[PDB]
Short mmCIF file of C-alpha atoms in Angstrom, two decimals:
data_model
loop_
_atom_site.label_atom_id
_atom_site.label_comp_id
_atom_site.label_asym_id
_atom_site.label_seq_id
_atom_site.Cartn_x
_atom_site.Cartn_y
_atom_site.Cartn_z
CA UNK L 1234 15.36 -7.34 2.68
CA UNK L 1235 12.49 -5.18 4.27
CA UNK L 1236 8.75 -5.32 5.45
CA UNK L 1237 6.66 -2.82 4.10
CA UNK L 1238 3.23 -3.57 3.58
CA UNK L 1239 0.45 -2.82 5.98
CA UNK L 1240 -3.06 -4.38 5.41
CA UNK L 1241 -3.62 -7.50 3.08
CA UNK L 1242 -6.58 -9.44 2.09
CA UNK L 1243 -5.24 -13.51 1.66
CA UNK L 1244 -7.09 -16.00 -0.01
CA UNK L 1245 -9.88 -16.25 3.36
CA UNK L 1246 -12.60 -14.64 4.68
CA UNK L 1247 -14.71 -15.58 7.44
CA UNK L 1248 -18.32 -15.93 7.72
CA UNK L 1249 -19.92 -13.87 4.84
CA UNK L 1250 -17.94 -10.80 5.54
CA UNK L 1251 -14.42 -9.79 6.34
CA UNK L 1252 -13.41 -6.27 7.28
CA UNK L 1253 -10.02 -5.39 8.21
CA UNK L 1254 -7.26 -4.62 11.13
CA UNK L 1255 -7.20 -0.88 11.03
CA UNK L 1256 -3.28 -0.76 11.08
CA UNK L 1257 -2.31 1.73 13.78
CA UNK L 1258 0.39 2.60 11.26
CA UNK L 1259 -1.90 4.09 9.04
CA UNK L 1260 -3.49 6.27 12.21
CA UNK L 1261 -7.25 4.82 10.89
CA UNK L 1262 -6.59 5.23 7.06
CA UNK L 1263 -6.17 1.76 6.11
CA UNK L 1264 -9.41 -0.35 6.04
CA UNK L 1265 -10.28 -2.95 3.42
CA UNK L 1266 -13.92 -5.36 3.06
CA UNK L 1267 -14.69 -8.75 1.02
CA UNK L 1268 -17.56 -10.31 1.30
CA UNK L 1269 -19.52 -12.98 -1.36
CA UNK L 1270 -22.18 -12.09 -4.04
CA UNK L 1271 -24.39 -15.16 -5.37
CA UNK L 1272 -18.63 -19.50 0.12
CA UNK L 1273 -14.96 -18.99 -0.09
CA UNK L 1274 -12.47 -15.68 -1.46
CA UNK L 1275 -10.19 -15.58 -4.66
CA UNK L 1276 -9.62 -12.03 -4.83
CA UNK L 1277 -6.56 -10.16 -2.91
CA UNK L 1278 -6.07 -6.65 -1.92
CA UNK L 1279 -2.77 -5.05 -0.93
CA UNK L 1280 -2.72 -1.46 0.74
CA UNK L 1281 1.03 -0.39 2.06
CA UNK L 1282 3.93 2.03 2.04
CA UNK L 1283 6.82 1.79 0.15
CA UNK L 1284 10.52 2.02 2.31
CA UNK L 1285 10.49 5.98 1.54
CA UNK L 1286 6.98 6.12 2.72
CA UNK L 1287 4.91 6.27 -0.58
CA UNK L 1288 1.61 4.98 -0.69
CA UNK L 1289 0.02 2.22 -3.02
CA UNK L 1290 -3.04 -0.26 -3.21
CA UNK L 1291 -2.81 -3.39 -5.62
CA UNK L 1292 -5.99 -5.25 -6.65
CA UNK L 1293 -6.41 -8.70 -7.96
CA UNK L 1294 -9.53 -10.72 -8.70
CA UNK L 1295 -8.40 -14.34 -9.89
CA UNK L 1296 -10.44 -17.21 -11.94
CA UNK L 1297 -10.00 -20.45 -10.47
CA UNK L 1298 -10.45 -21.12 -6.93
CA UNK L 1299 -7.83 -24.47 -7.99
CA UNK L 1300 -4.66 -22.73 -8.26
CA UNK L 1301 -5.80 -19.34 -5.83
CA UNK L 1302 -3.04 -19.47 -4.01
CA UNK L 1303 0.27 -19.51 -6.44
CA UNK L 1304 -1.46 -16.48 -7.58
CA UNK L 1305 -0.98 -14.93 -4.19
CA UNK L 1306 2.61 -16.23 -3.52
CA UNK L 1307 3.23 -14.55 -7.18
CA UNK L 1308 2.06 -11.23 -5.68
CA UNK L 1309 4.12 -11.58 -2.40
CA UNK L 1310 7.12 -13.23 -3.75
CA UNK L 1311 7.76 -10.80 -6.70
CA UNK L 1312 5.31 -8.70 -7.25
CA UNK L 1313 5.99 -6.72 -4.41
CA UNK L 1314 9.39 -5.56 -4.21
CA UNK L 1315 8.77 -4.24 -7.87
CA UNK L 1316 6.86 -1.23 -6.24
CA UNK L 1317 9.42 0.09 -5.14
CA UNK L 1318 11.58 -0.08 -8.99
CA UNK L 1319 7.52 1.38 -9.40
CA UNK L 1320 7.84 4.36 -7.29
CA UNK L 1321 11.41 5.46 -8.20
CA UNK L 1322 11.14 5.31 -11.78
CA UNK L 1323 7.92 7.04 -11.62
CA UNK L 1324 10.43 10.39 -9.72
CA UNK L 1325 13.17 9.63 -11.67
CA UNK L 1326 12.09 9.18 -15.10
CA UNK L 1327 9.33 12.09 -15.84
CA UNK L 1328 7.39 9.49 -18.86
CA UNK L 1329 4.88 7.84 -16.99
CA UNK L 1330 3.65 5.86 -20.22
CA UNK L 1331 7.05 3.73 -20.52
CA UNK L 1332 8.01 2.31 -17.35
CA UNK L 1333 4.44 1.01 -16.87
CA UNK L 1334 4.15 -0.64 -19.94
CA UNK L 1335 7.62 -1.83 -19.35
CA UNK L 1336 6.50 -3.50 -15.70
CA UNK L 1337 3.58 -4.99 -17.34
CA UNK L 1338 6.07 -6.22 -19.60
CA UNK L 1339 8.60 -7.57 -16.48
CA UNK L 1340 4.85 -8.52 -14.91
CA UNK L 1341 4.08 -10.88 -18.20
CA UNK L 1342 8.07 -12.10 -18.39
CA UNK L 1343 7.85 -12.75 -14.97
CA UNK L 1344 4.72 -14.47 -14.36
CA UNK L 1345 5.50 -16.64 -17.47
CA UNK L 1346 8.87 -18.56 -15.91
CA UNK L 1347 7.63 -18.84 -12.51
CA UNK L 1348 3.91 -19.26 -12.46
CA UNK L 1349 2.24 -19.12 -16.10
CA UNK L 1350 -0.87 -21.43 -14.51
CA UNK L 1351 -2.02 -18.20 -13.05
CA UNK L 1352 -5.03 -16.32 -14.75
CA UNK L 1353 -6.14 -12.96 -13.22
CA UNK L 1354 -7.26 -9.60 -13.41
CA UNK L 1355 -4.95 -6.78 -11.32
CA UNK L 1356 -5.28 -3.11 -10.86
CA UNK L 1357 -2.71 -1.14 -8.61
CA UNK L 1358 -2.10 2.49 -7.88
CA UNK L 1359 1.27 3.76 -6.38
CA UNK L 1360 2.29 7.83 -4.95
CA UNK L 1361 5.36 9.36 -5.86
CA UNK L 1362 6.57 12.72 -4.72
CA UNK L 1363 9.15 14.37 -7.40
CA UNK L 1364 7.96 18.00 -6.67
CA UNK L 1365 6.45 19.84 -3.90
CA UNK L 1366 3.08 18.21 -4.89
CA UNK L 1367 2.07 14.39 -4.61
CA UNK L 1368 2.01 12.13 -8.01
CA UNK L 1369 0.20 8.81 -8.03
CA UNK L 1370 0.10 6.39 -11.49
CA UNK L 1371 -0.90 2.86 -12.15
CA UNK L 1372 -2.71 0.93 -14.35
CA UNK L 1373 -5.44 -2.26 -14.08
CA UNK L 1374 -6.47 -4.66 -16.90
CA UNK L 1375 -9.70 -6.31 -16.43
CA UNK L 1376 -12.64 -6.75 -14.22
CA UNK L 1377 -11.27 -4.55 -11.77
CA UNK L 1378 -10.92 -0.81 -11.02
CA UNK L 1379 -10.25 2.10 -8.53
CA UNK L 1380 -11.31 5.40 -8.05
CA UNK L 1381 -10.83 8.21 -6.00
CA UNK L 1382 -12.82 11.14 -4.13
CA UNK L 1383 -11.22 14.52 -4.02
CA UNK L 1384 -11.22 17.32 -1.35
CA UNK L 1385 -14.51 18.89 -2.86
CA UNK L 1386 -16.51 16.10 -3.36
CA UNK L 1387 -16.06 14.55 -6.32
CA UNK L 1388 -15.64 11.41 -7.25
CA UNK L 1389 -13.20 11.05 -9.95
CA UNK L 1390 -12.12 8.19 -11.64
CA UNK L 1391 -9.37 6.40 -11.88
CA UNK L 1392 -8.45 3.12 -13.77
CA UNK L 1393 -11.47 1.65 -15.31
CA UNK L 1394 -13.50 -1.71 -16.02
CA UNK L 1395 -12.09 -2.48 -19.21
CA UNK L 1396 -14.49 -4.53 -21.04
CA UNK L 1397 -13.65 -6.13 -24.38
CA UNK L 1398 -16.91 -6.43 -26.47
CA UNK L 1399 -17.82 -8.95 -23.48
CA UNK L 1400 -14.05 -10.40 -22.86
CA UNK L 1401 -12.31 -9.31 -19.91
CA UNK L 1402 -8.69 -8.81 -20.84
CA UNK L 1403 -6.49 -10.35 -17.94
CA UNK L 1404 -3.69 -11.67 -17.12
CA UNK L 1405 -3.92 -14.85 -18.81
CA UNK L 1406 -1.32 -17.24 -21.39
CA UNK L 1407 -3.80 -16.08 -24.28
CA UNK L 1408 -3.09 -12.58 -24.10
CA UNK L 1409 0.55 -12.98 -23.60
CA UNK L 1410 0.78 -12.60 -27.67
CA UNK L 1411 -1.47 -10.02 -27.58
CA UNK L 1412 0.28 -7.47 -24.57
CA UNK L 1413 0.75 -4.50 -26.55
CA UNK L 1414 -2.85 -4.42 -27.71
CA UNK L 1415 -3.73 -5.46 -24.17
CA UNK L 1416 -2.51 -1.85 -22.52
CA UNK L 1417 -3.85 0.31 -25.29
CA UNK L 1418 -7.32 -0.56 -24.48
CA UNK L 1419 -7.11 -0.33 -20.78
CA UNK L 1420 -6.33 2.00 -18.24
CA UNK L 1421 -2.97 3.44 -16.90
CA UNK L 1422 -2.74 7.00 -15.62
CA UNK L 1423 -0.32 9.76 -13.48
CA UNK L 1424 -2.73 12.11 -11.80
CA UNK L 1425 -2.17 15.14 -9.39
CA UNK L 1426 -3.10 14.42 -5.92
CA UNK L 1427 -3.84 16.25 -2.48
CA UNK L 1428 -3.69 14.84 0.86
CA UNK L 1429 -6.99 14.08 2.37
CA UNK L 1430 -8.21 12.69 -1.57
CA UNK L 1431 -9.74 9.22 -0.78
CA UNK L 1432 -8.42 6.36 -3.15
CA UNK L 1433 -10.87 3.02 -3.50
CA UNK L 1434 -9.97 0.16 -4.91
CA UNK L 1435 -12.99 -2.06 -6.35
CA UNK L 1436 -13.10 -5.83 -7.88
CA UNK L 1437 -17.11 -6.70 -8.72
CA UNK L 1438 -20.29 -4.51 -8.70
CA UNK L 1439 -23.57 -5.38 -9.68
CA UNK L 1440 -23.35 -3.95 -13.56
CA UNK L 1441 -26.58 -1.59 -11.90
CA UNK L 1442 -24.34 0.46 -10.74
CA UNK L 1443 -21.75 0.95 -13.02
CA UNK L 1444 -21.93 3.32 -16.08
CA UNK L 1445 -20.53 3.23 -19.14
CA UNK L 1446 -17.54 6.07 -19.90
CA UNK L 1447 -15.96 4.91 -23.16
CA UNK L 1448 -16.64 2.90 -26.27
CA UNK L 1449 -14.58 2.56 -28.91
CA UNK L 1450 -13.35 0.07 -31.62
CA UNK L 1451 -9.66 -1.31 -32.56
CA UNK L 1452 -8.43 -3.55 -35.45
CA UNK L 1453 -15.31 -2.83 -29.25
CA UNK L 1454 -14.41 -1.80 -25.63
CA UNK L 1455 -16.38 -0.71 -22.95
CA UNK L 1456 -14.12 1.50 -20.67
CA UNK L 1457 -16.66 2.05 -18.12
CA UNK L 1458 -16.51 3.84 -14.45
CA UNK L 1459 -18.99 3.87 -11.32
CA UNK L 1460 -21.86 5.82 -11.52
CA UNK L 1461 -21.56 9.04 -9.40
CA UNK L 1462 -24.81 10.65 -9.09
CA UNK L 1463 -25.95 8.06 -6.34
CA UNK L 1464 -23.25 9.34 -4.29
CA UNK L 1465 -23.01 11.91 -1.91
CA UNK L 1466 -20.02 14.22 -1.33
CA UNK L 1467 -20.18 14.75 2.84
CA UNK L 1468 -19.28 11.24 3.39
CA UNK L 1469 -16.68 8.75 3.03
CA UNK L 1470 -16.47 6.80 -0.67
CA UNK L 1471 -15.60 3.31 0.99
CA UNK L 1472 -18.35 3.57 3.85
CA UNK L 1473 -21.07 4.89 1.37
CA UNK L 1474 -20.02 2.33 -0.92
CA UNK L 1475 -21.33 -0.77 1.07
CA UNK L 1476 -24.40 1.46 2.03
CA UNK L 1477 -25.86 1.40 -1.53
CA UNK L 1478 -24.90 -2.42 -2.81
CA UNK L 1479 -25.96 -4.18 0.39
CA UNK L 1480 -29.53 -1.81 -0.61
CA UNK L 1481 -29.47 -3.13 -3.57
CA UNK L 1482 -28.52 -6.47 -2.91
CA UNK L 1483 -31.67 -6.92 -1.41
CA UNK L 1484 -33.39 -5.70 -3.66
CA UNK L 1485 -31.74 -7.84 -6.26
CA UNK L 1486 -32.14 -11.30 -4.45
CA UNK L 1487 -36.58 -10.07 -3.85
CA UNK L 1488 -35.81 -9.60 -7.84
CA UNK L 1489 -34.40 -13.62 -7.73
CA UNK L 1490 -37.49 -14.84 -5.93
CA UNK L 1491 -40.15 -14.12 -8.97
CA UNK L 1492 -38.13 -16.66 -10.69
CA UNK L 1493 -39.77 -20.04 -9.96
CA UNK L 1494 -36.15 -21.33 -7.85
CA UNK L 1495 -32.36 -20.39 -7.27
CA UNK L 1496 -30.97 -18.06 -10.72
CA UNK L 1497 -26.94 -17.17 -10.52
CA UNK L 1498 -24.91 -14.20 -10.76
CA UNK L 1499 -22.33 -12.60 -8.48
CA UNK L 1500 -18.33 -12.28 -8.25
CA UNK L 1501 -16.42 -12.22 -4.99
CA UNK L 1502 -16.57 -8.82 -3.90
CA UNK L 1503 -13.51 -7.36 -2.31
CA UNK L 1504 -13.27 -3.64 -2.03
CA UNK L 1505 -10.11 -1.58 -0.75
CA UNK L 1506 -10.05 1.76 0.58
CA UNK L 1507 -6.77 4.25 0.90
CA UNK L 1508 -6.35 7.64 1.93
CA UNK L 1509 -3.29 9.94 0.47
CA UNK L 1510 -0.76 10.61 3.59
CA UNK L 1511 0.31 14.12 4.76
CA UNK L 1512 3.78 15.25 4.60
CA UNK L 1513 4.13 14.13 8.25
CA UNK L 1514 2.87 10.75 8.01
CA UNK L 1515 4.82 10.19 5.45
CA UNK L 1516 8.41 10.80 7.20
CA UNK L 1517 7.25 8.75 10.54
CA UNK L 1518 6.41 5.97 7.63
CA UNK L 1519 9.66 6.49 6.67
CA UNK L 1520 11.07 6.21 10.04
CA UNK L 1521 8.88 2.59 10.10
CA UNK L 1522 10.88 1.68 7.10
CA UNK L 1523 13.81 1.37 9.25
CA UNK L 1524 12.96 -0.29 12.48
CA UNK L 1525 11.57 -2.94 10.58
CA UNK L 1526 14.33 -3.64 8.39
CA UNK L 1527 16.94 -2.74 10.91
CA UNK L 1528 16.41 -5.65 13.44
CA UNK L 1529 15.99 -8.92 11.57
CA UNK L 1530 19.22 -8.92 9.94
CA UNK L 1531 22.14 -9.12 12.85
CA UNK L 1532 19.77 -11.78 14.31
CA UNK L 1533 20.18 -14.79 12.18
CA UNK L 1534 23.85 -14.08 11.29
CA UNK L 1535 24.66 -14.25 14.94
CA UNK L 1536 22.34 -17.09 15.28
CA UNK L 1537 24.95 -19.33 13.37
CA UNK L 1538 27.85 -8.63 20.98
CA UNK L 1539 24.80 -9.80 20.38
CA UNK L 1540 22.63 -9.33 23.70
CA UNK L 1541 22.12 -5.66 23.36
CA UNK L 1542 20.40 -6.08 20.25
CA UNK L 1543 18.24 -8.45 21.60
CA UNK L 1544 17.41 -6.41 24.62
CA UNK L 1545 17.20 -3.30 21.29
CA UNK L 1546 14.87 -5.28 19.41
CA UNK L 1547 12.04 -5.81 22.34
CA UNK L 1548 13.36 -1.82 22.68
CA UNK L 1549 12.45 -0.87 19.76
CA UNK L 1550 8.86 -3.21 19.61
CA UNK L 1551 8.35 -1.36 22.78
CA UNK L 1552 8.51 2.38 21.42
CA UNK L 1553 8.00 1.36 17.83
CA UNK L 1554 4.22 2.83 17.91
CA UNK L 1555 5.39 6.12 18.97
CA UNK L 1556 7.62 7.52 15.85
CA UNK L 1557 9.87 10.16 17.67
CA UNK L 1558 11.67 7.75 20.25
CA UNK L 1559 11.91 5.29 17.99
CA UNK L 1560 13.62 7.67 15.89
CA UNK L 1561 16.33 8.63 18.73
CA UNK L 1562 17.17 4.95 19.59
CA UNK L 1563 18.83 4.58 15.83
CA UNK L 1564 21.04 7.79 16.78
CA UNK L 1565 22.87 5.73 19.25
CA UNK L 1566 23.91 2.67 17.70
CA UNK L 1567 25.55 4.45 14.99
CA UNK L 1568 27.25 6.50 17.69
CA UNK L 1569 28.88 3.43 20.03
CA UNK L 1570 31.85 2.59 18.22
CA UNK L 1571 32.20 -0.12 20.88
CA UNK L 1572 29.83 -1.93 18.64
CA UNK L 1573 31.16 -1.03 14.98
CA UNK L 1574 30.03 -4.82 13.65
CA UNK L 1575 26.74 -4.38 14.89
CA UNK L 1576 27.13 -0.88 13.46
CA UNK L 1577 28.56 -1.79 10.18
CA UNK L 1578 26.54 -4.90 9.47
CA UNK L 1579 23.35 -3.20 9.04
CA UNK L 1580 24.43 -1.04 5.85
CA UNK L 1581 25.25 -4.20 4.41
CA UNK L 1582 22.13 -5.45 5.22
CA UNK L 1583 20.30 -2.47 4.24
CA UNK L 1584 22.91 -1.67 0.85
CA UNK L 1585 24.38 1.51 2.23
CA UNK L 1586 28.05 2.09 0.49
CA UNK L 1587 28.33 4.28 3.50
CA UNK L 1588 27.16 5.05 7.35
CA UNK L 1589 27.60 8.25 7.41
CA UNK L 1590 24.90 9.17 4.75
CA UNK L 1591 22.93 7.25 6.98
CA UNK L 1592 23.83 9.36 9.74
CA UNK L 1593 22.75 12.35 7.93
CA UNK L 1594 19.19 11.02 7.05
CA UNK L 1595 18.41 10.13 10.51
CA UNK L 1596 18.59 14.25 11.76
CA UNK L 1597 16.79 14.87 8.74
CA UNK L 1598 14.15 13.08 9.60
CA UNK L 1599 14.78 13.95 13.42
CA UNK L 1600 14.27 17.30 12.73
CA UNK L 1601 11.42 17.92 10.83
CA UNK L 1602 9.34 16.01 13.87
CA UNK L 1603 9.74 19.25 15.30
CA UNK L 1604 7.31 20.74 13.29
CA UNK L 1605 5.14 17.85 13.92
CA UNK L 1606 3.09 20.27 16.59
CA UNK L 1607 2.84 17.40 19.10
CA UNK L 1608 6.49 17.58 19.62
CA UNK L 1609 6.01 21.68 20.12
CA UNK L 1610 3.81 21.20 23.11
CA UNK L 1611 6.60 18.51 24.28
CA UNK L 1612 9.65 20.65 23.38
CA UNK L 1613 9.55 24.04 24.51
CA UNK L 1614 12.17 26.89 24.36
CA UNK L 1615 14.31 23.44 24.89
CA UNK L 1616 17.19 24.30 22.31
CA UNK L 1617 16.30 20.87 21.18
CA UNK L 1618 19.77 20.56 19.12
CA UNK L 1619 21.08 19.83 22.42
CA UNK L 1620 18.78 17.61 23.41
CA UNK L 1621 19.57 14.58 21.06
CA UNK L 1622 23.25 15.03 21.92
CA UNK L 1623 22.05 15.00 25.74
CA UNK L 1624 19.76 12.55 24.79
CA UNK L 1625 22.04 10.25 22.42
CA UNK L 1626 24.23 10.05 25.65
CA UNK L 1627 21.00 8.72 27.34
CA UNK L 1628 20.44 5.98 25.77
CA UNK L 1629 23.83 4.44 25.95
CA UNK L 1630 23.16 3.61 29.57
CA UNK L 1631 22.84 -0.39 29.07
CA UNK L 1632 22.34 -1.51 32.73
CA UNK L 1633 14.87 2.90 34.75
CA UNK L 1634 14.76 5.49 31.61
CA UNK L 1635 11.54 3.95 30.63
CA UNK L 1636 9.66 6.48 33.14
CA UNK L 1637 12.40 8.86 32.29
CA UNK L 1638 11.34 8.22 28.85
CA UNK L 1639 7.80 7.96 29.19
CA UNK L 1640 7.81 12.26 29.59
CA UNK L 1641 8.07 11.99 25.39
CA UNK L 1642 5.12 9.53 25.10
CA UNK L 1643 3.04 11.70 27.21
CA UNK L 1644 -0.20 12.31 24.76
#
């Protein structure tokens, strides 16, 4: 019961190349690219926010383009709503080792009894806040692999290319014996992170590029990471990235013409980029959380006091880009007790034993927008605790604010 995700790679691309939709909800941080490396996309990348804001990027890379697309369904079916059981745990319980393996474990369960006919390789990364600082943790098994760029310019990284003495561990029926062997050989983590620190999210390189990191044996692996020295630490990772492979891509297919006619090599290169949100970004994502989830629900019920809602839900995707009035809006249909099914419906639709905690997270979030400083320059010396009282009573007006209004979206 909620829309969180932001930016997603399906199972298409056009034309040789396929870059992205620069989600205003990101404010220019989310931005993915695919393109092909010898005609058509298997790999999926999935870059969102979880319903208490937290950031997280999931990977895949399948193996057949015959099934491709029960593979994606998986993700967006199931998959998904496990981030946020992801998330939670990771603030709740402090040992980041066990609830991973255990959702690999509920990953494996759960991709036997509802789609075992799908083989492929995932990597995902996911924030959590349970102190003043930012935590992010994952894992990935198999051809895939992220890694991250700090504040100073370096390019650390995070979960690996896991290479089994030339066998890619994956998601696959054959492993399913095998799981607990399966995670101590790749890559999970819980690293300290600052805002600004660039996450990328990578599925094939030419192996030119990459260098090895880690070899050792169990009763060989190749835990290897992306070579760092041909990097440079004034730009971007993701937009140097695609500098360097295209560079070399050429210079790999003038290697391919020495070679009497057409040789073969090449995966389907997608590549996912992510930035770690502020503390401010983070609460107006958490404001998203709720105008998304809020409207959809009363809308079907009634389906089979109604037209306010309808005239609130082209309301709200009016002033849904700007976070602050879409904030306020909430504050009055809690407050008409002229509507209390309209009111009390949406806990049950969004779980809440009861509105008045509710209540009490919307001027929590309300208030700290104040020290957003774009809301200084628009309230000042204004007493604003007034102000959404004076303001709450605005709203209520059912039958021209919009001008009225517009003095907030002034920017």
């Amino acid at each position: 019961m909620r829309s969180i995700i932001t930016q997603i790679c399906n199972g298409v691309l056009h034309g040789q190349s396929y870059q992205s939709g620069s989600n205003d909800l990101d404010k220019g941080n989310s931005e993915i690219f695919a393109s092909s490396l010898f005609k058509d996309s298997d790999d999926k990348i999935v870059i969102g926010y979880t319903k208490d804001g937290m950031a997280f990027q999931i990977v895949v890379d399948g193996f057949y383009g015959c099934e491709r697309q029960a593979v994606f369904s998986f993700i967006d079916n199931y998959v998904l709503p496990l981030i946020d059981n992801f998330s939670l745990d990771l603030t709740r319980y402090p040992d980041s080792k066990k609830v991973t393996e255990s959702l690999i474990h509920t990953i494996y369960s759960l991709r036997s009894k509802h789609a075992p006919l799908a083989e492929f390789t995932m990597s995902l990364c996911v924030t959590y806040q349970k102190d003043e600082q930012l935590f992010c943790a994952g894992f990935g098994i198999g051809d895939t692999g992220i890694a991250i760029k700090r504040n100073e310019g370096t390019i650390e990284q995070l979960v690996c290319h896991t290479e089994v003495d030339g066998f890619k561990d994956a998601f696959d029926n054959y492993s399913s014996a095998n799981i607990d062997l399966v995670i101590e050989r790749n890559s999970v983590f819980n690293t300290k992170v600052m805002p600004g620190d660039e996450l990328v999210g990578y599925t094939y390189v030419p192996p030119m590029l990459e260098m090895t990191e880690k070899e050792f044996e169990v009763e060989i692996v190749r835990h290897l990471n992306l070579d760092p020295g041909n990097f440079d630490d004034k730009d971007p990772l993701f937009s140097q990235l695609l500098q360097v492979v295209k560079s070399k891509q050429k210079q790999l297919v003038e290697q391919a013409k020495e070679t009497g006619q057409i040789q073969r090599f090449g995966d389907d290169f997608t590549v996912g980029r992510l930035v770690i949100p502020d503390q401010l970004l983070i609460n107006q994502l958490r404001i998203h959380a709720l105008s998304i989830g809020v409207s959809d629900g009363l809308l079907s019920y009634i389906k089979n006091n109604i037209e306010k809602a309808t005239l609130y839900k082209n309301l709200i995707a009016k002033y849904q880009n700007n976070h602050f009035i879409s904030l306020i809006i909430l504050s009055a249909l809690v407050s008409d007790s002229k509507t209390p099914l309209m009111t009390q419906y949406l806990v049950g639709y969004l779980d809440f034993p009861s509105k008045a905690l509710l209540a009490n997270k919307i001027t929590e979030l309300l208030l700290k927008e104040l020290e957003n400083p774009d809301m200084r320059e628009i309230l000042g010396s204004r007493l604003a605790t007034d102000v959404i009282e004076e303001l709450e009573t605005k709203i209520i007006r059912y039958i021209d604010i919009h001008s009225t209004l517009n003095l907030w979206t002034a920017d």
